[PDB]
């Protein structure tokens with residue numbers, strides 16, 4: 078594991094974490110103890126190494142006495158390794174508890190601390206975590222590798238008017254004995270998980286039940302809207318259970334975060350985290366929920382052993398997601414989404430360049446910050462490989478049989494690409510000659526678009542392409558023929574695909590874009606996917622009226638899918654360049670630490 082400085086699982090492994098901590102909003106620190114139950118995998122083990130990042134270590138206690146530890150030099154985005162001297166040498170399989178008193182930095186990359194004004198209610202502050210990929214070390218000392226799976230329990234002291242939630246079953250609450258202005262929330266996660274799945278939020282939260290095993294959680298002002306948006310959740314769980322086997326996590330709760338949440342969603346066990354940019358008013362962005370649900374099998378049960386193997390998580394999860402959405406809304410819709418995805422892959426490959434190492438399916442992360450490598454490639458090249466295998470090997474019913482067997486086989490494990498490929502070949506031993514037709518070396522190890530494109534139903538895509546083509550080939554004297562009725566029979570998804578089709582050919586003449594606003598009134602659509610793509614098209618087509626709209630969307634939410642390209646478009650437009658860097662500089666301090674880092678790199682600032 079090239080992204081971790083800890084002792085590998087061949088040396089020792091964490092089986093359990095007990096976390097007791099207090100969330101201090103005045104200092105923006107989390108302070109407490111992490112008791113790691115560690116099992117030796119070696120004879121005569123006398124030291125072990127943990128990952129840390131910007132932690133302050135007070136002391137390390139084993140068998141009731143303090144022990145020697147040392148922090149090595151910081152290795153950039155990897156943090157600093159912490160070597161611990163064991164008081165007694167351990168034999169193979171022996172376990173001990175190591176209890177570490179620690180405190181986080183206010184500047185912890187795993188965490189965003191929000192002032193009251195940054196929330197809906199404007200009364201209370203808010204804290205949230207996002208550990209994936211390698212930020213759990215910025216919360217607590219751990220072996221920060223998905224190659225190790227541990228259970229955990231926690232007790233978290235927070236100001237009594239706030240609520241703590243984690244990726245775990247809620248285990249009760251009480252006043253804090255040590256300070257009656259506080260409450261302690263307790264948590265148990267009894268299913269072994271990789272440490273990137275450890276998550277905390279603390280805020281003025283409320284919940285509403287929306288299914289037999291689902292509460293939606295948010296600040297008071299979003300609860301009603303969220304409950305409606307995510308009402309398909311239980312029915313997606315039922316379908317996911319048909320496809321992946323039993324749901325083993327007990328609860329499936331949803332947490333809708335404040336707008337700065339850096340991603341679409343994070344599949345935290347027991348409590349999925351989603352962006353509020355999903356709240357479109359019509360459930361149209363529900364594929365993200367289906368995605369997060371799917372991770373309860375692919376990712377959370379079968380986990381990538383290292384981050385080089387991240388496509389295992391995402392490709393399988395996108396593949397199950399599109400199946401759930403296919404069940405709900407028809408096989409033509411699965412194909413429409415599948416084809417859209419291939420279009421998103423062309424975009425990423427074009428952005429990075431077609432010989433770029435990040436466009437490889439399996440990546441080598443040696444010396445690479447995983448946050449910098451992150452993109453649509455593992456999702457879409459991964460999905461495209463599985464969609465191609467589906468078609469090669471006899472269709473969706475046959476391939477779903479493999480997917481279910483794959484989950485059973487590697488449940489509670491961490492695996493590599495060769496483990497998966499090996500199982501694939503074993504499962505389809507009667508179709509090995511077909512599998513030997515796959516260019517594996519190209520699919521897995523080569524940059525650029527895949528060597529083969531799957532076959533796609535075009536039914537729902539056609540009208541999108543026909544309209545996109547009308548606009549691109551139009552001349553000035555054709556602009557009059559466009560009318561609000563062009564969009565008549567297009568769903569929100571088709572408007573989005575129409576915009577994506579056209580964005581692929583941007584810039585368009587500025588007169589065309591103005592006409593498009595005149596006839597389609599895209600400025601008035603609040604759907605975040607549609608508005609995102611429409612504003613990108615305006616900025617790339619040099620429409621100055623779109624500049625304050627694109628500045629406003631980039632900074633009013635922080636979902637990096639939207640905030641990173643909007644800022645990048647704005648800096649590439651000469652008329653908005655200085656404003657873009659001005660805006661970033663002003664917002665930087667109150668941005669998500671990783672978001673701030675990546676936007677800065679994108680803009681070449683600092």
Ligand SMILES: c1ccc(CNc2ccc(OC[C@H]3CCCN3)cc2)cc1
Nearest residue numbers: 209210340342343384387447448450451
């Ligand atoms: C291709 C691209 C990136 C990588 C590893 N980097 C990586 C970086 C961040 C990751 O998680 C961040 C967000 C994504 C949604 C939930 N959390 C996950 C992986 C591996 C292969």
Ligand SMILES: [Yb+3]
Nearest residue numbers: 120121168169
């Ligand atoms: Yb020994």
Ligand SMILES: [Yb+3]
Nearest residue numbers: 247248249265
């Ligand atoms: Yb209990």
Ligand SMILES: [Yb+3]
Nearest residue numbers: 499500502503
């Ligand atoms: Yb084999």
Ligand SMILES: [Zn+2]
Nearest residue numbers: 372390391394
């Ligand atoms: Zn995912």
